[model samples]
Each structure stands twice: as C-alpha cells, then as structure tokens.
Target: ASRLYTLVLVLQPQRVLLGMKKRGFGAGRWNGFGGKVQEGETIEDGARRELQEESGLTVDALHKVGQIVFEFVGEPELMDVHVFCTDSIQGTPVESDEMRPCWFQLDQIPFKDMWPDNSYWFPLLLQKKKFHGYFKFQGQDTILDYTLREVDTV
Candidate 1:
C-alpha cells in the first residue's frame, strides 16, 4: 500500500481557498491540502508538514478520520490515503510558491478545477460525514466501476 496524507482545513462556513499546484501528478488543478507520507514520518506528521509547506497553515488540532486504500493490477501505482479533520490552526493561511490559494464560497467551489473524483466524495467530508471511497482513474477517465465505501459516522 502506498502511503499518503490529506488535510481537511476548515475556514468559516464558506471561505476555503482552493490551492493549485502546477507540476507533477496534481498539476493544473485545484486540490486540497496534502501529499505523500515521507520516509520515517508518521501520517499525522506528514499531513502537518504538507499543510505548512503548501499553505503556511499549522493545524492546532487534528483528528484522524479514516483511510482509503486503492489496489489495482497493472496500474503502476497503489494508493493509501489518510484523511484528517482540522478545525483549529495557529497560522494565517496563505499561498506559497508551491500553491496559489484562492478562496471559494461553499456554493461556488471550483469543482471543475479539481480531480474528477473530488466532486463525488468531497461534499460528504465538507458536511463532516464520515466515509470511505475508492476511485480508479485510468488516463483521463474516472472508471467508477472500482469504487467502494464504508462509513460509521457522519
């Protein structure tokens, strides 16, 4: 399983900024706040580092939500995504050289600017609904035939 980390940063009810990174796998799209787990770092630490490195925000508290593991044959990559919730932080969020943060209202989130799978499961997380989702992207298509879910709380 590939190790990964993601941060669920909370801004007011409708004030999150979409950050865009223009290179590598997530290039050219608006995305959330995280990346891969570094060697010897715990998932929580990785999440914290990524948040600071990408957005200049340090979470004051973070609660682990769950994880999503994607396994497929011949895909060249497997994914293990850890999700966390942060309702408090110690620094003002700002755009860094690696990302450009743009605030969006809840009703005006930039869905088209993000990965296709985000439109499906991101809303649940926004509502603080616990969930697990698996998505397979082959090239530019979402191939949803591989998704599955498990939720114990919302």
Candidate 2:
C-alpha cells in the first residue's frame, strides 16, 4: 500500500525555507516541512499542518506541484509524497522540537545534505513546472532506479 505524505516548500525571491529535521525518517538532512498525512484530514490540510508544526509558518494557499512515489527494495509500502509550494506565508519561521528551519538561497541549496532524488526534481520546481516521479531505492543512500518527467500538470 502507498503511505501518503506531504512536502511543502515556501519560496521567496531568491531563497526557500527548509527544515533540518531533528528526528524521524529524514533526520540529519535538509528538507521541506512535511510528513505522513494523518487519518480524517484533507491532504491540503495535512500539508498546511505539517508546515505549521515543523516551521511555525502559516500559508493561506498552496499550489500543488509534484507527486513522487518512493519504493525501497524489499519493502511492500511505498511513500507517496505530494508536493506543494507557495511564495507567500504569514509569521516568521521558528524552529519546533522536530525541525530547525532556515532560508537557503536557490543557488546555495545544500543538495548534498538532501535526498538524492531532490536533485532531479528540484529544478522543475524552481522552473515552476508540474511533475510526477517514481524512485526505487536500494536503501536510504542509494537509488536503484527512477523515472522523473515534467508534466503539463501534476
């Protein structure tokens, strides 16, 4: 079964907000604020909730931009990540117990410290393109294969 998750990014003129997760599945890496879409919640609601929970910022509206499914070899579950973005938000970003938030210049994103697949699809986001992707990984640090492409709409 596919486990639904959400990833939200707040973009500005030259930078973006990302979180340094203190714990959980993506600990020790820089990533957008997001996690599992809980029961009884709308996906968009989950996206907004995650951003607020992890970064303390509230976005009034979000644009859905990408969708990705990550499959780790030998695992039956697939991580279905729905991606959302916005260039505007309310309140200053502050760290929560689970996340340390910071702004990274577009050209200075620490790709090395983020998920490998991010490198492939992040540009599409910067270009404001919609996309869909599938990544199969051997483990956390290695992708066995993937297919990523820009689409007219996600």
Candidate 3:
C-alpha cells in the first residue's frame, strides 16, 4: 500500500529554505517542510499547513514541481510524495518542535547530510524543471536503484 505526503521548498534566487527534522521519519537530517496528507485536505493544502506549522511561514503560492515514489526494500508501505516549490512567502521562519528552519545558499546545500536520493533530483528543482522519480531504498542511506526524468508537467 501507499501513503501520500507532501514536501514544500521555499526557493529564492540564491538560497533555499530547509529544515532539520527534529523527530519522526527523517530525524537528524535536513529536509523541506512536509508530512502526511490529512484526510479531507488537498495535497497543496497539507503542504501549506505543514510548512506553517513547522516553520511559521505562510505560502503565498505553491507550484507543483515534482513527485516521487519511494519504496523501501522489504517494507510494505510506499511513500508517494508530492513536491511543491514557492518563491512567494509571508512571515519569518520560526523554529518549531518538529523542525528547525535554516537557509542555505544553492552551492552550500548539505546534501551529504540529507537523504541520499535528494542529491539526484534536487538539481532539477534548482534548474526550475519539473520531474518525476522512483527510488528503491535498501535502507535510509542506501539507494539500491532509482530513475528520474524531467517532465513538461508534474
């Protein structure tokens, strides 16, 4: 079975806002703000809520940028994550119990400390290209295999 989730990235010309996961699934790693989609809410809505809850920032607009199917070898559940990006935002990023927000210059993104699969499609996001991906992970840090491609629409 598959569970739906969302990830929202706040992009600027020279930097991107990411958060350190303080707990839960991706703890100890840096990532964008998001989590499981709530019942009766759209993916974008859940993304907006998660961002605000985790970072205290309100999204003015969210552009659907990509999607990924994450499969963990031997795990029964798949993570179907919808990705969104926004350049328009309101409010200061305030840290919450779930995430500690921070900004990183494009060239200084800490990919080595993030999910291994992030380094692959993140460049496409930086290039403003829409993409689709599938990753099979043997464990949290090991990508057994994967496929990614740019798309006209996401």
Candidate 4:
C-alpha cells in the first residue's frame, strides 16, 4: 500500500500575486501550500500541521479531490501525492524556512517557475474537476508513461 497524506489549503489570487520565496524542491519558484506525511500523523493532521507550519494560516472545509502515485525504477520508494482543496479558511500566509508564500493572478500563475507537471493539471483542479494522474519522466528528455483518471464519489 502507498503512504497517504493531505495538503489542505485555501488560497487567493492576491497571495499568488505577492510572490513566493526561493528555496527547496523547486526553489526560486511558486506553488500552492503543502508538505509531507509525518510519522504517527493522520493525513488530515499532516495537512493541518503543514498548513500552519508553512503558511501560518488555519482554516476548515478541506476536501480530498485526487491522488497520484509514481514509481521510479532506481529509487527505493514511490511518490504518493494527495491533492486537496478548501473553500473556507481564515489566516494570513507568510514565509517560513521551508517555503516563501506568494500570490499570482488567476491568469498569471508562474508556470516556468514550477515543476514541469504543474502546467498540465493544476488548472483543472483550480476549476474544481477531480482527477488522478501519473507521469514517468527520467531526467528531462524522456517520458516513460502518462495516465489520468476521473473519479466520482459515491
């Protein structure tokens, strides 16, 4: 079984407009609010903790929309990502050691400054359509496989 985690967040265009700090993963770039699954922590707990730890914000109504899992041939572990969204929250976002928060206009997300995959699916999530996807990329020039799925809650 894959590890599970949540990245619950509430954001606004103004936040994106402000711009993020330069560090970690995609350093000198911009992305949404999130982090990892800590030991002995529930996905929701991780989400809430990460939200507060990274953004200094606290809000509710977080929902799980989709998930993605990827396996790299030479790596010992797989990447399991859970994408979340929330329509309610109250707090101000600020920069921390792990992340520097930024705001961008709805029409002006910093695509070049993010992971290559963000260009493909982030907008769909912004539009509120739930989706699951996987992409296998070796270095920058190779593509092993790409797949997507649409899920419905029953």
Best-matching candidate per lDDT: 3
Residue lDDT tens for model 4, 1-154: 4555455536453333223546664456565666679888877778777777777778577788777665555665666778777757677777777677665666777777765666777766677778787867665334477787677740
Candidate 4, residue 47: Cα displacement in angstroms equals 1.1
Compute the lDDT for candidate 1: 0.71
| Deviating ranges (above 4 Å) for candidate 1 | 70-74, 148-150
Per-residue lDDT over 13-89 for candidate 1, one digit per residue giving the tens place of the 0 to 100 score? 65665688867767888877788888899988998888888878878787766566654556766777777767677
Q: Which pairs clash in the backbone of model 4? A: 15-102, 15-103, 16-103, 16-104, 17-103, 17-104, 18-103, 19-102, 19-103, 22-28
Which runs of model 3 end up more than 4 angstroms from their true locations? none
When 2 and 4 are scored with TM-score, the better candidate is 2
TM-score of 3: 0.98
Which residue runs does candidate 4 get wrong by more than 4 Å?
1-5, 9-22, 140-144
Candidate 3, residues 17-136: lDDT per residue as tens digits?
A: 999998889999999989899999999999999999889999998999999999999999999999999999999999878788999999999999899999999999999999999999
- Candidate 2: residue 46 lDDT (0-100): 97
lDDT of 2 by residue, 43-154 (tens): 8999999899889999997999999999999999999999999987999999778888999999999999999899999999999999999999987899989999898878
Candidate 2 total steric clashes? 0
Candidate lDDT values, in order: 0.71, 0.93, 0.94, 0.65
**Where does the lowest 10-residue lDDT sum fall in candidate 2?**
93-102
By lDDT, the better pick of 1 and 3 is 3
Shift in Å, residue 77, candidate 3? 1.2
TM-score for candidate 2: 0.97
> What's the true lDDT of residue 95 in model 1?
69
* Cα error, candidate 1, residue 47 (Å): 0.6
